[PDB]
Design a binder for this molecule. Structure first.
Ligand SMILES: [Zn+2]
Ligand SMILES: [Zn+2]
Length: 49
């Protein structure tokens, strides 16, 4: 079966918990740590659980 998963573009790891997906770029996501460290911070992101 094809499983769906969100890999953080900052630490190449999985996105567990809050997903911060960029509203500008296509297909860009950050985990809470990379988001909290200011990666990709000038683009608006959708923070959903
Ligand atoms: Zn990360
Ligand atoms: Zn972006």
């Amino acid at each position: 079966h094809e499983e769906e998963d969100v890999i953080c573009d900052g630490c190449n790891g999985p996105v567990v918990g809050t997903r911060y997906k960029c509203s500008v770029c296509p297909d860009y996501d950050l985990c809470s740590v990379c988001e909290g460290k200011g990666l990709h911070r000038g683009h608006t992101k959708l923070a959903f659980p």
